[PDB]
Design a protein around this ligand. Structure first.
Ligand SMILES: C[C@H](CC(=O)O)NC(=O)C(=O)O
Ligand SMILES: [Fe+2]
Length: 294
């Protein structure tokens, strides 16, 4: 039935053939999750699923959690995060072109989930994909001066930079929305590096989209150049996307991307044209927290 073909050596990614979430065994799920923690990306091939079946597939990997802002939610399945620029019956479903920035999912939240699932529905014919950076691999290749400078430091993550304007936000003062974002989703504090509870790797838990500051042990803020140097060194400032840390993951019809939300930061690659693009997303919590300090 299920057959996992991992990429050779330390290459990122792994293809999964003949996977049926309804008939997959417990050993198939454990082996798949083990591939996600080690190969970071698991591409399920030939997935023809309804929105209800996509949620049932995500339930096999963990406990799904719906996005906190309801305008992203699928009308039928509230646990499905919808990124869509294609109206259905003239109504806007989801939010158009999400995640066009380096980030980890729910990084700005106090308890991020460990597994992210992406099921593209409408795929533009050419320049479409998703960039990826292994922050565990990025920390290992950091310069020694940066490793010891961030030792014992903390980082603050906030969605204040890419919080999308909601339909009911029209005609409201922009400072009224800013204070609402800082009230409902205040900046969370995480250690700059944590230990992956599944693999034991040291993960540099930062992202240009969500990480807004860096502090030492006492919470005393450090110069924001330290964060900018970390973004530059890991490849999050390369607008050409030719950095060695950057991996471009494309997909065909029927692919279902399941990747490690602890180690990986990602960025949506969209066309420079108004070409239709629809993607469904399910995000689940596994048997452990983001790290053993949460
Ligand atoms: C703000 C952003 C959605 C968007 O780009 O509109 N949130 C996430 O990506 C997530 O953490 O799930
Ligand atoms: Fe995302």
């Amino acid at each position: 039935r299920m057959q996992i073909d991992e990429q050779p050596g330390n290459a990122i990614g792994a293809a999964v053939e003949g996977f049926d979430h309804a008939t997959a065994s417990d050993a198939d799920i454990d082996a798949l999750k083990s591939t996600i923690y080690t190969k970071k990306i698991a591409v399920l091939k030939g997935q023809d699923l309804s929105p209800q079946q996509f949620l049932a597939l995500g339930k096999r990997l963990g406990r799904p959690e719906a996005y906190y802002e309801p305008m992203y939610q699928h009308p039928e399945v509230t646990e499905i995060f919808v990124s869509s620029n294609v109206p259905e019956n003239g109504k806007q479903i989801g939010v158009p072109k999400t995640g066009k920035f380096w980030h980890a999912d729910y990084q700005f939240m106090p308890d991020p989930f460990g597994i992210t699932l992406i099921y593209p529905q409408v795929i533009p014919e050419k320049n479409r994909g998703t960039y990826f950076i292994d922050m565990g691999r990025a920390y290992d290749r950091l310069p020694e001066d940066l490793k010891k400078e961030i030792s014992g430091t903390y980082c603050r993550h906030s969605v204040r930079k890419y919080f999308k304007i909601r339909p009911h936000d029209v005609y409201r003062p922009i400072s009224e929305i800013i204070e609402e974002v800082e009230r409902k989703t205040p900046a969370v504090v995480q250690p700059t590096t944590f230990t992956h509870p599944m693999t034991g790797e040291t993960v540099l838990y930062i992202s240009e989209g969500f990480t807004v500051g860096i502090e030492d042990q006492d919470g005393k803020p450090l110069d924001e150049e330290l964060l900018k140097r970390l973004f530059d060194a890991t490849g999050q400032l390369d607008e050409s996307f030719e950095h060695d840390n950057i991996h471009l993951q494309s997909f065909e019809q029927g692919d279902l991307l399941v990747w490690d939300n602890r180690s990986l930061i990602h960025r949506a690659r969209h066309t420079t044209t108004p070409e239709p693009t629809v993607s469904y997303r399910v995000t689940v919590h596994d048997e452990r927290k983001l790290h053993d300090g949460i």
